[PDB]
Amino acid sequence: MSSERTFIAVKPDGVQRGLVGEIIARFERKGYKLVALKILQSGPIVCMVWEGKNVVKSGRVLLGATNPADSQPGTIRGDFAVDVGRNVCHGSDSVESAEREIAFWFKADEIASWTSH
Template structure:
């Protein structure tokens, strides 16, 4: 019905509509592909807050912890070596302020330097927590950071965000926007599809 056979003439409006429809489908397909690609890339940009506690620093475990996250394929976007104030630690652990161990926790965390870090990658919050192991090292499996390097819950060497929301809050508490380095490792294409 694009061509009128007896008169051998084209129906231009019908032809233009079909071409527009094909063009729209093609554009829609391309946009959908890039939308999925953008979604996948955005998922790779999830961030988590990880902090080596004073006992981990004193025992010289910072490098081993960083190595595990790098070997997994996560990207370090911020890190500092600092002696945290009690005020900062009270804000960080505010959700635990009613617990009887809170004063001891703040004293312990302010007893020596800590290494707060921000790591980026696909499902980094969930996977990071799995890499840390259970809060109580006695419940942590071998192969996890706590399972391999610590014995008691009061000296469990590392903190990790438990959800994306808490990660965002903790990152904002410990780092300003200029301290978060946006970069692309050369090996990223070997980690993500």
């Protein structure tokens, strides 16, 4: 509707195979503003937050069905995943649980903000 946020993350298997550039770029080219980032340490992981109108449903469509075997080429699991264990990434589930996800990972100051062009 306006200025809604959502939460993506990159599982240990993505990071390890060299995919962090690829994911980030697909979000840039759609039009969505990036607003916080960091890494953390099984294996390591990358956390982010993306802002624009509908970022919630759009994200889910970019990623592809959660069971690789069901997803479509053109999407991220469609071009790179094979099983549900090793499925490369997680994206925020609903315009509610965006918050329980964000607020549980990102302290107040970390989130920046600015106007685009």
